[PDB]
Design a protein around this ligand. Structure first.
Ligand code: CH1
Ligand code: MG
Length: 977
DNA sequence: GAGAAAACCCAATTGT
RNA sequence: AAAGAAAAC
DNA sequence: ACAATTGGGTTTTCTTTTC
């Protein structure tokens, strides 16, 4: 639509609004006014922007000049121009607030003044000044009254927002003053946008060469800072000269931030450069995004929104604090709106060309400015002024990419200096205060930085557009769930941290997940050397990850921290700080604990031992009674694991989840030797997971009796387990073929297990191909070290066979629903429309596939993605219902996606809630509601007759439900266990 | 400054 | 951006 | 029809990309 430069100049004029100094923007408008082609292709919004800026300045003469230019060249005044005129009259006093001209002209012309006060976004001060200038003539006008906040009246979300009920809303263990000073610490952390963490690499006793390298590095850093300041001044002068030469420039974009801050940015980006450095484009995009992240925070400091946030947050913490009370207990967003909330007013992101040009300019500045003497080993008087970073191209790849390499001496200086400090950005670290409530798609999560509501790659905006144009009460439960997942307080387990750091700083233990040092790689000649370099690179790449996660664990060791949460486009909720969270590896889950603990109660130690047995991986198919018996039998190994983790018989290393098993052995040993095990405060999360969840949801949509009996929707004394049935069938087939001398069938004995066929049997209901199942079985066979690696490939072809022998008596109505969904998605995409639906909790979901280069939907991708995305949206709705009705009863609830975590005391309660919020979820006609929504959405147009008829008879051919009572899932024991 | 690891699949979509 | 690996559902 | 494309879905992270 709009041109690149036409979109670019609007960002320019908004940027001149952002940092004042506005006559350069006015001068550029005058230069465009000089030549009639130069003011051509200029949109009206840039005139509105500069008028509003002069209104903020209070200059009426320039306002009238821009008005005259608006009536020139055929442009028409709109509402923002009258808002700017009334704002100028608000700042001034002449004409006594347009007695004679402006409001009378507006009323005569026919534009509505209620739309002036309400529709278009203005800040509170500008709204007040325009309100005063309107009150100059006809003072009897009043603003339309603020309505009481709307409450969602959806049937699934009626109980959570009904006042007539008993609620037990939990409170943090932290007093209000401590919470307030932690808010201050997080604010100071976000203001200086990066955090320094001491590295958990082995500290070395310093030597003379270490001092010499560090002194040289400090002198070089000071010289680089001076050089970057000179380069930034020269760039700012030349770009200001370009603005005064009447062309586009990025000079206000450099004037967004202080020169100190930009030089500190460039130096800290240089510090975290790889040894074989990052490409030009990624580094440029990082520089621009980091510049925007600092600009938002700086704008909130200057604009005064930080003090408003401070006041509101100190009034807000009374709901969460232990020693404070609210007059009526409410949900966190309801209390956030009850205390009159400020406008968020976070800046919308710039157009992508401006961002790219800013990044390349900053990167080329860093390449050009910083330099070093050539030789450090020989200190001659004549040393060549050599660059620190080099631009090289890459020959191997198809499309050549620029790579910035460090100068090779700098690598040895960084190795010998051995700086003990890593640097993180503030958004990649857990928050030190409770996060802001999710009150809108725009507000929530971090304090000063904007966070998306839906995680999207490549800047797809149709998800956010669906979330904005929905009815506002539809997202409430979703928002509530996200806030509920943010308010959980976490802490780091100390003993596990000491053990992992002992293994990490010493010789690493790759069996237990701890990466080994850069040494201890293994060491026809070229083949061996290439293998050693490849394995050494893999070892180094793993140990860097471990260094970052363990450094954050060391930093957050004596702290209480929070993880704000987010969604993807389906409804599924992930935490925002990436390095150290509970959706991670075994070590990440072992390090983490609830900061608030609850007493165990009668069923705390019982569920704790059940959780431990589930962690060891042994006894999966047994009832819970035999899980308890197994826990009671192996108690000596539990106590020896807890007492001597590394100098004992080391039974916990044999567990399927070994570090989590060690943490639970520590918790159990603390519980059993206590004087009163029942009144013991436990901080360890206990897990409950559902068996074959996508199959559970297919069975609940179909009401299939055999399907519901298959995935534990019908109660039984023993668990039912689909994958160990399919494994038994394939083992029967294998023995039959291996009796006939089939070599691939012969070399598989003891190698067909649940884990081999698990993902394939899980995935046949999502339309897997035989090729995808082959890669699944291949990756599961490569992990078994005992199995012959020469015969993996043929084994894979023998195992896509005999597993796809599930043709009859396996998931009939499940594949009927799957077929109807796939045909529905195929025929929706055949007309050219992406598949949209609404979650039963009200969340709109759209599929961002559109593989065109993005103009036309990719039919294959849409039909393959619709069954998993629909079932995943349903399980997210299940999770959010369970979370909300657990909040109403006082439960600390976090979710790892079919896996629900709580204290050991509340597990039964959560189970009850879980089953109820399944039953209420699928009692709704989800198939019928989806069918009529898709008929309304895609089959309501008169232009296409036959296509809409075929899609309508496809959509109205919904599969009929079977005969299964959903209430009986409330009686099920192994539904979630 | 300058060439035997080996990838092996095999049927539904899509630009042409 | 492409490749070598790793983790979670 | 012909040859190229593709392979059930989602989320996160690391050091290297000519030897
Ligand atoms: N590669 C994939 C694709 C989808 N899911 C989705 O997560 C759901 C449950 O996650 P799992 O950990 O695999 O648990 P189950 O399928 O229920 O198997 P189990 O009985 O052992 O818990 C199933 C499926 O809808 C998954 O875990 N892994
Ligand atoms: Mg599960």
């Amino acid at each position: 639509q709009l041109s690149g430069q036409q979109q670019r100049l609007l960002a320019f004029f908004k940027c001149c609004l952002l940092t004042d100094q506005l006559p350069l923007a006015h001068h550029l408008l005058v230069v465009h006014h000089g030549q009639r082609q130069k003011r051509k292709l200029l949109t009206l919004d840039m005139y509105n922007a500069v008028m509003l800026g002069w209104a903020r300045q209070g200059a009426f003469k320039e306002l009238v000049y821009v008005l005259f230019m608006v009536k020139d060249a055929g442009l028409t005044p709109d509402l923002l121009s009258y808002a700017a005129a009334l704002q100028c009259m608000g700042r001034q006093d002449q004409d006594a607030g347009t007695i004679e001209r402006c409001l009378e002209q507006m009323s005569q012309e026919g534009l509505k003044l209620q739309a002036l006060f309400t529709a278009v976004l203005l800040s509170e001060e500008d709204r007040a000044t325009v309100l005063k200038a309107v009150h100059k003539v006809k003072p009897t006008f009043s603003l339309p009254p603020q309505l009481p906040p709307p409450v969602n009246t959806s049937k699934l979300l009626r109980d959570v927002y009904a006042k007539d009920g008993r609620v037990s809303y939990p409170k943090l263990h932290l007093p209000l003053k401590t919470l307030q000073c932690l808010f201050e610490k997080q604010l100071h952390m976000e203001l200086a946008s990066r955090v320094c963490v001491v590295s958990v690499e082995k500290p070395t006793l310093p030597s003379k060469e270490v001092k010499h390298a560090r002194k040289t590095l400090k002198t070089l850093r000071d010289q680089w800072e001076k050089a970057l300041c000179r380069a930034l001044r020269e760039t700012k002068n030349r770009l200001e000269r370009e603005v005064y030469e009447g062309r586009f420039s990025l000079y206000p974009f450099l004037c967004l931030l202080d020169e100190r801050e930009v030089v500190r940015m460039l130096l800290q980006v240089l510090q975290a450069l790889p040894a074989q450095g990052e490409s030009f484009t990624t580094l440029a995009r990082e520089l621009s995004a980091r510049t925007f992240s600092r600009h938002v925070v700086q704008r909130q400091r200057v604009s005064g929104q930080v003090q408003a946030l401070q006041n509101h947050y100190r009034k807000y913490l009374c709901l969460l604090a232990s020693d404070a009370e609210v007059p009526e207990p409410c949900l966190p967003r309801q209390y956030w709106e009850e205390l009159g909330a400020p406008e968020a007013l976070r800046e919308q992101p710039w157009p992508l060309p401006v961002q790219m040009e800013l990044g390349k300019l900053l990167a080329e500045m860093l390449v050009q400015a910083t330099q070093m003497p050539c030789s450090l080993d020989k200190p001659h008087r004549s040393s060549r002024l050599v660059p620190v970073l080099y631009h090289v191209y890459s020959f191997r790849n198809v499309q050549q990419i620029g790579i910035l390499k460090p100068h090779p001496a700098y690598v040895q200086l960084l190795e010998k200096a051995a700086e003990p400090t890593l640097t993180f950005e503030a958004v990649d670290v857990p928050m030190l205060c409770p996060p802001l409530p999710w009150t809108s798609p725009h507000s929530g999560a971090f304090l000063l930085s904007p966070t998306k509501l839906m995680r999207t790659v490549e800047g797809a905006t149709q998800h956010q557009e669906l979330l904005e144009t929905c009815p506002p009460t539809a997202l409430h439960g979703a928002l509530d769930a996200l806030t509920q997942l943010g308010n959980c307080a976490w802490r780091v387990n100390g003993r596990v941290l000491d053990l992992v750091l002992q293994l990490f700083q010493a010789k690493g233990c790759p069996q237990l997940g701890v990466p080994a040092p850069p040494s201890e790689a293994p060491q026809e000649l070229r083949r061996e050397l290439a293998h050693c370099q490849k394995v050494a690179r893999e070892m180094h790449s793993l140990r860097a990850e471990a260094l970052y996660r363990l450094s954050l664990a060391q930093h957050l060791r004596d702290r209480v921290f929070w993880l704000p949460h987010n969604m993807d486009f389906r409804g599924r909720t992930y935490p925002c700080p990436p390095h150290f969270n509970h959706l991670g590896s075994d070590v990440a889950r072992a390090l983490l604990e609830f900061a608030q603990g609850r007493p165990l109660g009668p069923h705390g130690l019982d569920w704790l031992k059940i959780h431990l047995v589930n962690l060891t991986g042994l006894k999966k198919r047994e009832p819970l009674r035999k899980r308890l018996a197994f826990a009671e039998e192996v108690m000596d190994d539990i106590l020896d694991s807890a007492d001597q983790p590394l100098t004992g018989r080391k039974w916990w290393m044999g567990a399927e989840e070994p570090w989590q098993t060690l943490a639970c052995c520590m918790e159990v040993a603390n519980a059993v030797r206590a004087s009163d095990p029942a009144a013991y405060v436990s901080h360890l999360p206990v897990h409950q997971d559902g068996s074959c969840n996508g199959l559970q949801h297919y069975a609940a949509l179909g009401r299939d009796s055999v399907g519901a009996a298959s995935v534990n929707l019908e109660p039984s004394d023993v668990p039912q387990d689909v994958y160990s049935g399919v494994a038994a069938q394939v083992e029967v087939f294998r023995r039959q073929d291996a009796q006939r001398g089939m070599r691939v069938a012969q070399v598989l004995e003891g190698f067909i297990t649940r884990k081999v066929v698990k993902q394939t049997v899980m995935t046949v209901v999502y339309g897997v191909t035989r090729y995808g199942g082959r890669l699944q079985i291949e990756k599961r066979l490569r992990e078994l070290s005992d199995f012959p690696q020469e015969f993996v490939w043929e084994a894979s072809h023998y195992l896509v066979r005999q597993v796809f022998k599930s043709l009859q008596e396996m998931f009939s109505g499940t594949r009927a629903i799957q077929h109807w969904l796939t045909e529905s998605a195929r025929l929706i995409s055949h007309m050219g429309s992406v598949v949209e639906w609404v979650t039963p909790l009200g969340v709109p979901v759209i599929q961002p596939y559109r593989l065109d280069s993005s103009r036309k939907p990719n039919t294959r991708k849409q039909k393959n993605g619709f069954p998993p995305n629909f079932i995943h949206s349903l399980d997210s709705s299940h999770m959010m219902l369970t979370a909300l009705h657990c909040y109403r009863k006082g439960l600390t609830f976090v979710s790892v996606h079919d896996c629900y975590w709580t204290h050991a005391a509340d597990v039964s309660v959560m189970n009850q809630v879980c089953r109820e919020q399944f039953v209420r979820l699928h009692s709704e006609p989800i198939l019928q509601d989806l069918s009529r929504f898709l008929v309304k959405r895609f089959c309501s147009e008169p232009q296409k007759i036959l296509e809409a008829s075929q899609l309508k008879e496809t959509l109205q051919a919904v599969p009929k439900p079977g005969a299964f009572d959903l209430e009986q899932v409330k009686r099920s024991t192994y539904f979630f266990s």
